[PDB]
């Protein structure tokens, strides 16, 4: 089967702490609203 991965699978890209700030990064991520393989 297939399913829409709404807004999910983001993770901490580094062990840095950043406080109340809109940081931006390039990394391997699950694309937003991608199409996940659902197994029964």
């Amino acid at each position: 089967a297939y399913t829409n991965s709404f807004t999910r699978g983001v993770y901490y890209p580094d062990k840095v702490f950043r406080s109340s700030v809109l940081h931006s990064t390039q990394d391997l991520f699950l694309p937003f609203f991608s199409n996940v393989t659902w197994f029964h």
Binding site: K15, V16, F17, R18, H23
Partner: protein, 48 residues
């Protein structure tokens, strides 16, 4: 393990020997301005 500021310079670290947080401030620096009256009046000066 360590904090960054808005400009992504290091702002804090966790001490790996004992896990408290150390804030890191720059070593202090600045201009040595000299205040003087006219040398055509005194040789006394003050340092800012």
């Amino acid at each position: 393990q360590f904090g960054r500021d808005i400009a992504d310079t290091t702002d804090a670290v966790r001490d790996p020997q004992t896990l408290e947080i150390l804030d890191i401030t720059p070593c202090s620096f600045g201009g040595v301005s000299v205040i003087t009256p006219g040398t055509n009046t005194s040789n006394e000066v003050a340092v800012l």
